[PDB]
Design an enzyme around this catalytic site. Structure first.
Site, PDB file in Angstrom:
ATOM      1  N   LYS A 144     -13.880   9.548  -4.827  1.00 30.39           N
ATOM      2  CA  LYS A 144     -15.157   9.948  -4.236  1.00 30.39           C
ATOM      3  C   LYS A 144     -15.585  11.329  -4.738  1.00 30.39           C
ATOM      4  O   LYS A 144     -16.761  11.553  -5.037  1.00 30.39           O
ATOM      5  CB  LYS A 144     -15.049   9.963  -2.704  1.00 30.39           C
ATOM      6  CG  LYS A 144     -14.628   8.627  -2.109  1.00 30.39           C
ATOM      7  CD  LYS A 144     -14.360   8.728  -0.609  1.00 30.39           C
ATOM      8  CE  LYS A 144     -13.659   7.463  -0.118  1.00 30.39           C
ATOM      9  NZ  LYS A 144     -13.288   7.669   1.268  1.00 30.39           N
ATOM     10  N   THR A 202      -8.035   7.381  -2.575  1.00 31.91           N
ATOM     11  CA  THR A 202      -9.389   6.915  -2.881  1.00 31.91           C
ATOM     12  C   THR A 202     -10.352   8.074  -2.681  1.00 31.91           C
ATOM     13  O   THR A 202     -11.410   8.137  -3.313  1.00 31.91           O
ATOM     14  CB  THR A 202      -9.826   5.726  -1.997  1.00 31.91           C
ATOM     15  OG1 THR A 202      -9.585   6.028  -0.621  1.00 31.91           O
ATOM     16  CG2 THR A 202      -9.067   4.467  -2.394  1.00 31.91           C
ATOM     17  N   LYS A 228       1.101  14.472   2.073  1.00 28.21           N
ATOM     18  CA  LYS A 228      -0.156  14.888   1.444  1.00 28.21           C
ATOM     19  C   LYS A 228      -0.140  16.396   1.175  1.00 28.21           C
ATOM     20  O   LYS A 228      -0.980  16.929   0.445  1.00 28.21           O
ATOM     21  CB  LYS A 228      -1.345  14.492   2.331  1.00 28.21           C
ATOM     22  CG  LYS A 228      -1.553  12.968   2.403  1.00 28.21           C
ATOM     23  CD  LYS A 228      -2.633  12.566   3.398  1.00 28.21           C
ATOM     24  CE  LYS A 228      -2.812  11.044   3.461  1.00 28.21           C
ATOM     25  NZ  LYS A 228      -3.386  10.488   2.188  1.00 28.21           N
ATOM     26  N   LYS A 264      -8.514  14.430   4.431  1.00 32.04           N
ATOM     27  CA  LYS A 264      -7.724  13.208   4.451  1.00 32.04           C
ATOM     28  C   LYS A 264      -6.849  13.330   5.702  1.00 32.04           C
ATOM     29  O   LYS A 264      -6.759  14.408   6.288  1.00 32.04           O
ATOM     30  CB  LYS A 264      -6.843  13.154   3.205  1.00 32.04           C
ATOM     31  CG  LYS A 264      -5.853  14.309   3.125  1.00 32.04           C
ATOM     32  CD  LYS A 264      -5.676  14.819   1.711  1.00 32.04           C
ATOM     33  CE  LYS A 264      -5.300  13.718   0.762  1.00 32.04           C
ATOM     34  NZ  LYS A 264      -6.227  13.626  -0.401  1.00 32.04           N
ATOM     35  N   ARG A 265      -6.210  12.244   6.120  1.00 34.71           N
ATOM     36  CA  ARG A 265      -5.362  12.318   7.306  1.00 34.71           C
ATOM     37  C   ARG A 265      -4.264  13.365   7.103  1.00 34.71           C
ATOM     38  O   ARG A 265      -3.781  13.575   5.985  1.00 34.71           O
ATOM     39  CB  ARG A 265      -4.744  10.946   7.601  1.00 34.71           C
ATOM     40  CG  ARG A 265      -5.744   9.935   8.129  1.00 34.71           C
ATOM     41  CD  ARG A 265      -6.235  10.328   9.525  1.00 34.71           C
ATOM     42  NE  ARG A 265      -5.180  10.204  10.528  1.00 34.71           N
ATOM     43  CZ  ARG A 265      -5.026   9.160  11.339  1.00 34.71           C
ATOM     44  NH1 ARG A 265      -5.876   8.141  11.297  1.00 34.71           N
ATOM     45  NH2 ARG A 265      -4.026   9.144  12.215  1.00 34.71           N
ATOM     46  N   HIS A 287       0.699  -1.291   0.000  1.00 37.82           N
ATOM     47  CA  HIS A 287       0.000   0.000   0.000  1.00 37.82           C
ATOM     48  C   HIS A 287       0.729   1.347   0.000  1.00 37.82           C
ATOM     49  O   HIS A 287       0.098   2.377  -0.238  1.00 37.82           O
ATOM     50  CB  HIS A 287      -0.980   0.036   1.169  1.00 37.82           C
ATOM     51  CG  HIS A 287      -2.112  -0.930   1.041  1.00 37.82           C
ATOM     52  ND1 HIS A 287      -3.257  -0.645   0.331  1.00 37.82           N
ATOM     53  CD2 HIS A 287      -2.280  -2.176   1.544  1.00 37.82           C
ATOM     54  CE1 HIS A 287      -4.083  -1.672   0.403  1.00 37.82           C
ATOM     55  NE2 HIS A 287      -3.515  -2.614   1.135  1.00 37.82           N
TER      56      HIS A 287
HETATM   57  O1  LIG Z   1      -0.988   2.638   6.835  1.00 37.02           O
HETATM   58  C1  LIG Z   1      -1.388   2.934   5.743  1.00 37.02           C
HETATM   59  N1  LIG Z   1      -2.586   3.586   5.652  1.00 37.02           N
HETATM   60  C2  LIG Z   1      -3.117   3.961   4.489  1.00 37.02           C
HETATM   61  O2  LIG Z   1      -4.245   4.565   4.515  1.00 37.02           O
HETATM   62  N2  LIG Z   1      -2.415   3.688   3.289  1.00 37.02           N
HETATM   63  C3  LIG Z   1      -3.194   4.204   2.111  1.00 37.02           C
HETATM   64  O3  LIG Z   1      -3.947   3.044   1.585  1.00 37.02           O
HETATM   65  C4  LIG Z   1      -4.789   3.484   0.473  1.00 37.02           C
HETATM   66  C5  LIG Z   1      -5.562   2.222  -0.038  1.00 37.02           C
HETATM   67  O4  LIG Z   1      -4.658   1.402  -0.862  1.00 37.02           O
HETATM   68  C6  LIG Z   1      -4.019   4.225  -0.640  1.00 37.02           C
HETATM   69  O5  LIG Z   1      -4.917   4.633  -1.652  1.00 37.02           O
HETATM   70  C7  LIG Z   1      -3.282   5.415  -0.054  1.00 37.02           C
HETATM   71  O6  LIG Z   1      -2.546   6.097  -1.113  1.00 37.02           O
HETATM   72  C8  LIG Z   1      -2.306   4.938   1.070  1.00 37.02           C
HETATM   73  O7  LIG Z   1      -1.581   6.049   1.664  1.00 37.02           O
HETATM   74  C9  LIG Z   1      -1.141   2.989   3.359  1.00 37.02           C
HETATM   75  O8  LIG Z   1      -0.442   2.693   2.407  1.00 37.02           O
HETATM   76  N3  LIG Z   1      -0.670   2.639   4.608  1.00 37.02           N
END
Ligand SMILES: O=c1[nH]c(=O)n([C@@H]2O[C@H](CO)[C@@H](O)[C@H](O)[C@H]2O)c(=O)[nH]1
Ligand SMILES: O=c1[nH]c(=O)n([C@@H]2O[C@H](CO)[C@@H](O)[C@H](O)[C@H]2O)c(=O)[nH]1
Ligand SMILES: O=c1[nH]c(=O)n([C@@H]2O[C@H](CO)[C@@H](O)[C@H](O)[C@H]2O)c(=O)[nH]1
Ligand SMILES: O=c1[nH]c(=O)n([C@@H]2O[C@H](CO)[C@@H](O)[C@H](O)[C@H]2O)c(=O)[nH]1
Lengths: 810, 810
Positions: A654, A650, A548, A542-543, A351
């Site tokens: 949305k 994601t 970001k 977003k977080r 991820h």
């Molecule tokens: O701990 C984490 N938390 C996250 O929210 N992500 C997130 O997961 C999403 C789903 O694949 C991605 O679209 C985001 O770009 C990624 O930062 C991570 O890669 N790692």
């Protein structure tokens, strides 16, 4: 009321009303004279839940009869949000329930706001798991979500004096009507102990036992009568635990703390023992459940044909050595056969490439907590490296680079390397992300086993993210092309033939204006804050994280403010800039960024000269339920991470689905979104990944930008001098220092192009008709980003199963 | 099947069956193919519960409309046992449910055994509160039971190697279908802090807050459609509690530990802080609830006319200073007026004169935990002693004897003195006990305020203790005199005209034989142990304590064994000696007594010469549900506490009501039982209270008895030499030492008369007809011991309310 919300039949409304009254009486033990809004919410929840049970029982019976291949999605996070409306939508009961409650003299929307969010996730990763469960049920897959039932989910965020304050999310306080405890399937999980090598095989003994009690929550598919299961484990101490007497009973808390709280870190690894325990806890209980169900269908050769295990990131990576342990130590299979089964059963999803997020557990931790697993990991490593050595003879550095064991200060186990070695498929979450995996961080692995690497671009469920949160938009769309698109989002392309339709253009713009008015009212209702509904809603939710770049957004906001102050009587497109998101409790810089945002607002929102031309609001406690409210009301979506850092994103999808235009970098899924809609219908700016690499090779020097951009210099000087913190002149010294001397994300490098791009956005907004036509072109091409497409690809290319759109008899 | 179990109407059986299936489906989410016995139990429980709600809602509405005086029974223990059968009995649904489940192909008795006991009590004191709630509902009083919802009740007892082992009683594991959470009435409770003296009154500030969440359980009256409430508080941490982040969330456990576990001490005071917190927790939350309900009826003058607070022992004694705190500090009433209201509102029940059981809290504890209450207690003491000084001028020793504050090593607060001073009525629990209170321990208080002292002899509910546990006996009785006695136990006297009735004599003996056969089978079923159903069932069940003298029983058993070994071929009435009860975890001597019992059994039960003439069995895990099984099967009831130590006893009443004859001392309620039945129909023996005093004045010397009684000497020599512990010769050295040098309870002094009396018992058992006629005379005169009589006396002589036998519309 509206078409897409189903029929409000005479019989059904009557039935709903009597069952609602039955639950209020028998279930809640109350009467209309003492019932509170919360009582009414539960009466409604139990009534809707009843409609699920029948389908839930037969769906599971169905899987037992047909014995299809089962998909097990393991995740430490499931960011579900609320369940009431989603259940009504998928069961086509929304209008009937709306009418029924109306006749009882109640407002259903008011009751829906009473439900607590199931915040068992941090952000994108947790939400992805939730969208996936919805799509898997809608596609008729025999899928199960397995995780942990945290007593406390992501903390509730409070803003005090402009600073983030955290408070416990006691979401189970009033009870959860959706879950069903299944104490009959309680399983034992082992910790600590030691390994004994006997005549026949090794044995893990002298362990401490913790029980895993499962709680099942129904996951309804969209109008297909399928109801899958999400099973979450809860930690329970054995009754002979620690058995002064009183103290022994009170110490049961120790063991039960395993499922007490969700770690609040987003894209960041914290090697704490409690977290490691949670990871093994979910894996150990889940695998026993899987094997039980498998035997109740000795022939483990067929295990991979009846079971697929998807690892969401490396969090559940221990499933690989745990499956080996069970097969070798308990079932007595030879290593080679056990390994074959494991690899064919497991698949891994990566991820994020940020180094600080990679799980690298200290060997001394695994050694004490899971002695047998450490031994299995060493053996896996030994055999894997033997394969590497044979493929690349003499390449000693490759051997150390690929090892699962990292040497140094403290030896650590690289869980990502473990996952690649033990899975038959490894996927990235967006085309550019998957390519980066093969070209950089996992280059060695790709060269050894190219066939393992795939791409599966993320998606979002159109049920929660369109129909549920934006019924007005779903309706005007259905009026033109029908309702089929709700489970086949690609059909939205048909809307392209309406881009010149004056009636449609007007309806799209009307729906957006209505959503903005509703949200503008919500802000005053629950947060008492005035905003101009006619302004452009510029939002970034977003977080909070440095990658970001909420900071780049802040620089733009200050630029807009300084320009207005310079030429007060010059016209500018009005804007309401909204920024929201939580910061991990121990992430200092992120907490300072939140303070900066509120500080900017304090100055901007009270400047007489600015008026209602510019407003900066920080959206408190951003969560799933809030996303469902603000996203439909947005005009501009901020997706401005430094190229190469956001694996996919994601939230971006949305916004695109709900009528907002996007300003962003060519990062993650943004690239595919722009590709689908056409670059002319997207506001792209900034460095591309190649540009970032060139800058790193050369050496990034923020001073250069500061010296050559007057407007930027002014902003930094305002921050340094205390312009935004009068009583505390050096309050933002850490921010300035980082930006000037150690900015890993090159904020300054994209500043000029960003501001320029934002000007083009304001230019288009001045032309309502053309802004809307571009919006239509975005909505029309957002079909690829439905999680139904994503799951269909996982099913065919990884799990080896065919998705089905066939209904089950209700 | 049997008359007293109600009608099994066509309509009701049909309705029960469909609702049972509805719950199995919608509530448990299962089908008959995967349902387990536990699933069926819950389906039945929810079905019966539904029949309660309607009556529960209207009963409470009724009290709101009529606004009668409310009775609040405060207790830290409510030993409820199981709820399913009791609910069916009181609602007259037993036969209908039996038939309905029968038609569904299920055995209701099997399902009833699945329910966990609500073991929120230790013994007599906790059971008394449970019987009282039942009688108060049956007598139509607007009563509420207030206590703590312990997560863990009295520990489950396991016997390993003859020793007691304790294991957590996780009774809420599978859920509790009877309770209803009422989070809407959550109240804050304060701890620690400090007192601030301002212009107007004192203020308690800087306190730590713990929330009290109530859970309501219905208490149905006997066939009168009345359903009262038992409200139990659960501790919850505030969400801003302690708010690293993770640790702060995990530390919530500290605050919530307050309602975690019941202290397992019986008749023994342990001054632990956690216990003090539990005591204040229940008192603080309960009083706020009482005042709320009172205001929802400013005029506190009428408070005593609408409220009565009964303190069950001194455990909730803090209610007195807490009521003063609220009235003075919060409501602003002058001290004198506040004190008047408090005294007229509170009543106190004393339960045992054993010195080690009296609560005497260290001042330093109250000082830190409840600073304001300590100040109020000092003021109460100051004014009380001023009254004493005026009544008995110059009597300085009386002043120190009566003070609420005890001087010495560490200053302590005598809670019993606090309760007497702040209550308008103080009662003992049996005639002899109440007299002892006035003559000894509370002599000074009685002389100052004679009017305050009363007697209220304990009782047991004839619903659970006759109809429910012994339907066979209730039936043959009803056949002769009707069903009215079930709620008017005095009618049992009519059975005296059947003492010479051959048919009745035969039925009484048949019912007992049937109960014994059933129990004899149960012992082999769940505990695998063989016993002769033809033998006399000699049983002593109650908590293990030195004052109850299970040791005297042991001496008799060994005597019987030695006599048999001496003259093997001599006839003796066969006996099965059963002893059961739990020992407090830290009570060493009690744990040694249990080991002695099993050790004796190990020898006696395996001696070929004894055969089936003598058996010694230790009844494991004695609790309410087990009492309901063994008491109906008993022939001989052992109530042999040293005269003057057992305040009342209630187990004794249960045995008398179920057809067992009693061998006991003139102690507690035994005196009144013998008085009611006639001494010739009771097996009385041993020292009377006056005899015990004479011995103490003279000085008790166990050696004397040992020197003059050959049989006793032999027993002590067997114990000392290791006859009952071959591998561990000195295992029972502590027991012998205590018996010989520091026996506070004079075991040896009653040995000779006890053995002699037991011979008379065996003599009568040899004459079946005469044994049974004596049994009838006991059952016929047990009416006085119904808790309905006890509660009627409390209502008229203490609470100032009239009991009602009028039904409410269902
Ligand atoms: O701990 C984490 N938390 C996250 O929210 N992500 C997130 O997961 C999403 C789903 O694949 C991605 O679209 C985001 O770009 C990624 O930062 C991570 O890669 N790692
Ligand atoms: O979620 C988080 N993300 C972060 O980036 N950090 C950061 O990790 C860095 C590496 O140790 C530290 O140097 C930073 O001071 C810290 O804020 C956190 O502490 N927490
Ligand atoms: O329930 C209990 N009852 C008891 O009588 N004891 C007793 O209290 C005495 C006074 O401190 C001690 O001297 C005894 O050794 C102890 O067994 C307990 O420790 N516990
Ligand atoms: O802690 C205590 N536990 C008790 O069980 N008792 C008991 O309460 C009963 C009800 O009044 C009495 O009948 C018993 O004689 C007494 O020992 C006490 O007096 N104290």
């Amino acid at each position: 009321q509206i078409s897409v919300r189903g029929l409000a039949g005479v019989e059904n409304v009557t039935e709903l009303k009597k069952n609602f009254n039955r639950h209020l009486h028998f279930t809640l033990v109350k009467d209309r004279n003492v019932a509170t809004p919360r009582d009414y919410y539960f009466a409604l929840a139990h009534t809707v839940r009843d409609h699920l049970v029948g389908r839930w029982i037969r769906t599971q019976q169905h899987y037992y009869e047909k014995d299809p291949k089962r998909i097990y999605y393991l995740s430490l996070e499931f960011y579900m949000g609320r369940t009431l409306q989603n259940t009504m939508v998928n069961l086509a009961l929304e209008n009937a329930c709306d009418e029924a409650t109306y006749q009882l003299g109640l407002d259903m929307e008011e009751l829906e706001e009473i439900e607590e969010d199931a915040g068992l996730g941090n952000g994108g990763l947790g939400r992805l798991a939730a969208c996936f469960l919805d799509s898997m049920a809608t596609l008729g897959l025999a899928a199960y979500g397995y995780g942990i039932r945290y007593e406390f989910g992501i903390f509730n965020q409070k803003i005090c004096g402009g600073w983030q304050m955290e408070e416990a999310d006691d979401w189970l306080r009033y009870g959860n009507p959706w879950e069903k405890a299944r104490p009959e399937f309680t399983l034992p999980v082992h910790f600590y102990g030691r390994v004994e090598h006997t005549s026949q095989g090794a044995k893990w003994v002298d362990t401490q036992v913790v029980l895993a009690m499962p709680y099942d929550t129904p996951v309804p598919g969209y109008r297909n009568n399928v109801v899958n299961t999400m099973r979450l484990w809860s930690a329970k101490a054995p009754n002979d635990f620690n058995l002064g007497y009183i103290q022994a009973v009170l110490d049961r808390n120790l063991a039960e703390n395993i499922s007490r709280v969700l770690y609040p870190n987003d894209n960041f690894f914290e090697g704490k023992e409690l977290r490691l325990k949670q990871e093994y806890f979910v894996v150990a209980a889940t695998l026993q459940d899987i094997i039980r169900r498998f035997k109740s269908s000795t022939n483990f050769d067929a295990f991979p044909d009846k079971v697929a295990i998807q690892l969401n990131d490396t969090h559940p990576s221990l499933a690989i050595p745990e499956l080996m342990r069970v097969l070798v130590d308990l079932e007595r299979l030879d290593w080679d056969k056990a390994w074959e089964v494991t690899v064919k059963t497991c698949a891994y999803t990566n991820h994020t490439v940020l180094p600080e997020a990679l799980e690298r557990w200290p060997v001394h931790l695994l050694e004490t907590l899971l002695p047998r697993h450490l031994q299995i990991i060493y053996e896996i490593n030994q055999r894997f490296l033997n394969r590497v050595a044979a493929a690349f003879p003499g390449d000693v550095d490759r051997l150390r680079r690929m090892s699962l064991v990292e040497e140094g200060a403290v030896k650590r186990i690289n869980m990502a390397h473990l996952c690649i070695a033990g899975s038959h498929a490894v996927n990235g979450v967006a085309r550019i992300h998957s390519e980066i995996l093969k070209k950089t961080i996992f280059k060695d692995f790709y060269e050894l086993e190219p066939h393992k690497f795939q791409n599966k671009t993320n998606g979002i469920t159109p049920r929660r993210w369109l129909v549920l949160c934006n019924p007005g938009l779903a309706e005007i769309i259905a009026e033109r092309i029908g309702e089929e698109y709700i489970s086949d989002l690609d059909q939205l392309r048909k809307l392209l033939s309406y881009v010149d339709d004056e009636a449609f253009i007007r309806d799209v713009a009307k729906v957006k204006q209505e959503n903005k008015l509703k949200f503008a009212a919500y802000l005053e209702r629950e947060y008492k804050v005035h905003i101009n509904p006619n302004s452009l809603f510029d939002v970034q939710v977003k977080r909070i994280h440095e990658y970001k770049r909420q900071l780049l957004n802040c620089l733009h906001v200050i630029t807009l403010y300084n320009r207005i102050k310079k030429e007060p009587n010059k016209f500018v497109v009005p804007r309401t800039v909204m920024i929201g998101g939580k910061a991990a409790p121990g992430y200092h810089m992120a907490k300072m960024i939140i303070k900066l945002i509120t500080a900017i607002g304090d100055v901007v929102n009270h400047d007489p000269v600015v008026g209602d031309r510019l407003r900066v609001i920080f959206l408190e406690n951003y969560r799933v339920s809030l996303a469902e409210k603000v996203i439909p009301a947005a005009d501009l979506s901020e997706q401005i991470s430094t190229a190469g850092t956001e694996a996919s994103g994601t939230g971006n999808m949305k916004f695109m689905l709900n009528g907002a235009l996007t300003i962003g970098t060519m990062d993650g899924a943004n690239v595919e979104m722009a590709e689908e809609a056409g670059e002319e219908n997207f506001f792209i700016f900034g460095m591309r990944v190649e540009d970032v690499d060139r800058l790193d090779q050369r050496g990034y020097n923020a001073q250069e930008y500061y010296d050559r951009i007057p407007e930027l210099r002014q902003i930094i000087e305002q921050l340094s001098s205390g312009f935004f913190s009068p009583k505390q002149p050096d309050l933002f010294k850490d921010i300035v220092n980082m930006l000037m001397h150690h900015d890993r994300f090159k904020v300054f490098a994209d500043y000029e192009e960003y501001v320029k791009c934002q000007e083009r956005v304001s230019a288009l907004y001045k032309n309502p008709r053309e802004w809307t036509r571009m919006v239509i072109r975005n909505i029309a091409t957002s079909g690829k980003f439905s999680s139904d497409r994503t799951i269909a690809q996982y099913a065919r290319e990884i799990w080896g199963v065919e998705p089905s759109r066939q209904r089950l008899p209700a």
